[PDB]
Ligand binder design. Structure first.
Ligand SMILES: [Cl-]
Ligand SMILES: [Cl-]
Ligand SMILES: [Cl-]
Ligand SMILES: [Mg+2]
Ligand SMILES: [Mg+2]
Lengths: 252, 252
């Protein structure tokens, strides 16, 4: 019957039962246990799932348990300190979605500053990694999307244009979060938070208006908006120096 | 203002230049080079990008070159045979999207029949792997989405509902592709191809009509149709034997 309504109590009671089980099973190999996500921020909604992380001492440990009782769902990730610290300092295109984890840790067990080390690692990533991630996002995501909607314009199917427009708006939101080095709180707040940031590429606000209102049925207006945003991307990347040499056919 | 229009002949000229560069640069370390995707499928559209894969001899090789010339985009993935074969036989939630690569390989260089081995491996994945992927998709993706839209029903923001409904339709399309062990042709064809299939969960077609028409502005209607789809998922899993384990509070 899908997820049920739960109070914080009820979620925190579940969390501590899981914490006790984790300690019972893995003992001294457990360096720390934390809750993250909306429950970690104390902004969990009545229907939110439960996300937990466990820092292991064990060499190369990297596994997870994700399950449901039919009424709620839990995900517990287990990583060695070195693997987690490596992950916390890697900036991919979806860093604004994934790494909010590390700014929302509610520590529930910690044998010696491990969760603070994770947070410090996440918040200390050097600027070059964000610069590289943005340039890669332009190539690997937005340029590809531009080809996809131009293909739709000339050969269909327009039945994919609403979904593609949503994907472009989300990629634009990742671009904005990388530029400002800010992680979105929840996936539901991404567009709301993205359009509140400064220095957006032109055309992004208009695109997000279509996506947030759900008025995605006028294909000519969507293609116009996507092209306008794509033009804004060209101006924005040039203004901020997110440019690589593209003159050679083969750059290796 | 790329991507520009190119013919298939122009793309294959680019492809063979890149093949010559790879062989020039990496030499005897190159086992095979193939084109995949729409171009490998000879169904590339006027604006399609170029996707290439390279099997390397060094056992831990795993890198890529992805770039644009301003006018077109190329992605070349380099993997050792061992890494590629393992990846070709892994079935994740997005297998219907990602593993079409392995059924669209056009070999352009091959010193040992390596690309046929990759294809055979991808084709020979056991049915249990799809069963496990379906159960994981329901728990890890759909159950989470249900919580997100139920939270929206009671506390907003409805501005995320069009994007969430798109994500739910795509997850349903992965479920259908896993059930039929079929990879979608292009990402733009996913919804059209998923809804032509047999054995759809009840409510999925109705939900996809909103997403494909782009009529995503009526929030009550989307919430009703998501709930109906969620119910249809429950009946569909029982009919097809995809029983998710809900018996343990803590399964470790
Ligand atoms: Cl570019
Ligand atoms: Cl291209
Ligand atoms: Cl297998
Ligand atoms: Mg979650
Ligand atoms: Mg590509």
């Amino acid at each position: 019957n899908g997820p049920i309504i739960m109070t914080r109590e009820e979620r925190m009671k579940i969390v501590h039962e899981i914490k006790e089980r984790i300690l019972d099973k893995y003992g001294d190999d457990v360096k720390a246990i934390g809750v993250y996500g909306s429950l970690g921020r104390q902004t969990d909604g009545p229907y939110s799932d439960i996300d937990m992380m466990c820092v292991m001492s064990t060499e190369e440990a990297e596994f997870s348990h994700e399950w449901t009782t039919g009424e709620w769902k839990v995900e517990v990730n287990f990583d060695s300190e070195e693997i987690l610290l490596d992950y916390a300092s890697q900036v991919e295109s979806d860093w604004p979605l994934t790494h909010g984890q590390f700014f929302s840790i509610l520590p529930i067990y910690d044998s010696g500053g491990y969760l603070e080390k994770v947070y410090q690692t996440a918040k200390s990533v050097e600027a070059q990694k964000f610069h590289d991630a943005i340039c890669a996002l332009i190539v690997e995501e937005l340029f590809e999307y531009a080809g996809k909607w131009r293909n739709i314009r000339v050969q269909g199917p327009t039945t994919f244009l609403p979904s593609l427009t949503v994907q472009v708006a989300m990629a634009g939101a990742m671009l904005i979060g990388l530029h400002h080095r800010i992680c979105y709180t929840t996936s539901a707040s991404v567009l709301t938070e993205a359009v509140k940031q400064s220095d957006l590429p032109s055309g992004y606000d208009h695109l997000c208006q279509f996506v947030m209102s759900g008025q995605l049925s006028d294909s000519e207006k969507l293609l116009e908006s996507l092209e306008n945003f794509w033009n804004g991307i060209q101006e924005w990347t040039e203004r901020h120096g997110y440019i690589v040499d593209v003159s050679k056919r083969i750059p290796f």
